[PDB]
Predict the 3D structure of the following.
Amino acid sequence: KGSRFISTLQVKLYGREGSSARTIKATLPYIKQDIPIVIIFRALGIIPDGEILEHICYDVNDWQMLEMLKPCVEDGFVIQDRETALDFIGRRGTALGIKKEKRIQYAKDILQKEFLPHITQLEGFESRKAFFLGYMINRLLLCALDRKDQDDRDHFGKKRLDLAGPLLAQLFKTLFKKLTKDIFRYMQRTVEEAHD
Amino acid sequence: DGPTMREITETIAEAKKKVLDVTKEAQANLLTAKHGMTLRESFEDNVVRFLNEARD
Amino acid sequence: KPMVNESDGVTHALYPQEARLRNLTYSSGLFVDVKKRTYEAIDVPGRELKYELIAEESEDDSESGKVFIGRLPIMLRSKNCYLSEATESDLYKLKECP
Amino acid sequence: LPHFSKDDYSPESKGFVENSYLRGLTPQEFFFHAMGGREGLIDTAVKTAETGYIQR
Amino acid sequence: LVQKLDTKFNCLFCNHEKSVSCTLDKKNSIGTLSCKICGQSFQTRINSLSQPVDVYSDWFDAVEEVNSGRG
Amino acid sequence: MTTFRFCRDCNNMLYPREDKENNRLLFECRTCSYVEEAGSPLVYRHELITNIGETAGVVQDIGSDPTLPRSDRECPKCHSRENVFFQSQQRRKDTSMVLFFVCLSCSHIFTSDQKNKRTQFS
Amino acid sequence: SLMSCISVGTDPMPIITFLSEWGMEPLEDYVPHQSPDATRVFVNGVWHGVHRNPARLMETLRTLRRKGDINPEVSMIRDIREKELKIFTDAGRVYRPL
Amino acid sequence: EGLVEYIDAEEEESILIAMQPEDLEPAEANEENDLDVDPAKRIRVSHHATTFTHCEIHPSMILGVAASIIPFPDHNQSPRNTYQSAMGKQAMGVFLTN
Amino acid sequence: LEPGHAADQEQAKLIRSAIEHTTLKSVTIASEIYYDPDPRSTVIPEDEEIIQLHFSLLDEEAEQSFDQQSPWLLRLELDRAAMNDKDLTMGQVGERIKQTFKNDLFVIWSEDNDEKLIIRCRVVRPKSLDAETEAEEDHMLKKIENTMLENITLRGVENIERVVMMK
Ligand SMILES: [Zn+2]
Ligand SMILES: [Zn+2]
């Protein structure tokens, strides 16, 4: 729509089949380090286990994917409450300036306005983004299980061309932002800038 | 001339038939993977060799 | 529409041929409307000054008027170009190539 | 190519060019030959500078 | 498995941006936030996911809950 | 998860705390008190050479796919001369080029392999 | 290429309303183990719900596009094997006439 | 009218295109024997499928502006075609009437 | 090859076998951990014949003790075709495991002719399992499986992959 909220989201699988591939962690915007998937799911409102597995794996008979997910739950068992997960994420975020609520507000802001921005401005994010993150992890595991091949960059359908329209659009967005900031500077500087 | 064009066409058709027979063998799982190569690489090697022989 | 403001202060409709010959950018002005809502100081001791609603009560909006943001360069034959609607008999009348 | 059914390993569907240059190329053979030519051109462009660096 | 680290968190009764230490015994899942200037300790639990940043910040939350210092 | 195992009153995940005195394998939610006895000796299976996912994606209307190729192989249990076939859907390099078929009137999967049957009954 | 064209973009809201009116169950009411065979309909990479009868929905969408009710540039893909229905309406997509 | 499409690279993965309208005739699918065995024509692969969804408007529309002025580009080899496409922009000629 | 063995064929194959690196992971189909408190028998009829084969051989040995007996079964099912290709028998793999697990893993063998190439293993923990199949932590068995499938060089030279004999 114009803000573009450009912030890459990455879900990573660690080690290897005989190594830290056991666990899965994700990177959030404006967060110091990555976090395991299960803590994020609990922060989004999916408290019980299984339900998180409902979101991630769409077929219980697919026992291999749940085997791969085992260590994620074995690592997330520590956190059990939504506010606890939000505290964890916010605390990992940055310095503990918000001592009162333990950075709950910061984590809420990040997970509402910067986590998967192409869905935002909606308290239903709790469920929508949770489902989309489950889809992300499902794709990751499917690739890791050799069910599907590695995604190809060269596919011409995965690319877009910025013709005169979008290029002038971003350029003019920057210039108009500069102009509005200058107008605001004149407002703040000059009392009764209204007429001037 | 015409006769050599027909001979070339027969050569290419024989190569195509050999490639088809190899494909049928591979799809029936009867093909034996060449040592040092899995089934797919052996099949591709055989097909490319046949086509190159046909061109030559 | 595309225009040029001469050094003499007289604005004149600009066409691509003159733009190319005179080294003038082919562009058209950007005019926008700017609402001007003024909330005069309320000077109401108490929580009223803590409420911006009381400032809203002091609302006094004046005329906006078209404000000249700048000039947007315009590509030729675009909907705003002078040549977009020109026919063949006009394309070479303006010394432009059909 | 979107003109072939999925999972096709036939010679015509994977780059083989039956025809000659005198006889012509069908659109698919034309595109595959363009693929090969592009590979060759990229290789030449890379060598143009890599070999010079080795020389120096 | 014993971790002690100094970081950028301030020194409260002791006014220094870098003077905050700690100890972390992961065998018993116990540790304490150690103040190299204001001193004594801040004993509490440890979690398997408790990184030293998490140690410091969560235990600082507990400090405000108790209105104590950073060690 | 080779089976289903979740606390009935917490939906959390159970893990194998064997009961030493009874010599029985027992499961109980770590964060709850519900207790459940193991119903099968299997607790772990790591499959290296897999025969799973070869035919993944067969749906009620795979026949409607225009891109997939079609043949005339006779359905073994239907004798229908129409079907749509494809190769194994797992992307392991060493996978064989065996074909899988699908009877358009039966939803029955038959393979071209001369030594093994469909994935579900190989 | 000669006949190639680049999409300029369209508002997805009308298409989302079309999808909702045509039986697209929202995510909030989605449960994987009650409709395991349901597809995943979505527009511009935003998972918008699930449809249990993808064939009929795809036929309707194609008919609407060919009738003009949907801007022809709007690209829709059905992945029969992966149980996903995709739609794209943003700009920058290079398409061709057939 | 529903006679042509706008197929994107992402959508063209799910379709099956015919190279030319002749690929659709039932004769090619069924009539394996014919007297048109002119040995001077390209060897064209026979009719392979029957689930076509679209048909190419025409080959040779896969070429660009500089390539589509080459006579018989399918009798050359690709490097020659690329060289010609590069060197056609240097040919002297009338770039405009004005 | 040496001058006296170059002209021949099977000796070249023997050199190939001596050089080529091969591990259990290259011949194992799947590895499963099973619950089975019984140290001498099993609740699984499938492995009953194999246990009986070694029941008269292993369980009949002098100085029987349960210190090497655990209620957990680390059942590995190998690939007959792969073992035949590598000229491997249950023997070789068994004594390699023993070398890596001299007395830390009681290992049972399946008859080569059996269609189920099974390596029935139990955890070893003296002073706790001496007269009981105490429930050893499964993570111990998982680590043991990792060591078997990664750190066990059945035969060959380390860092020497497929060896291609040619003339
Ligand atoms: Zn519970
Ligand atoms: Zn049938």
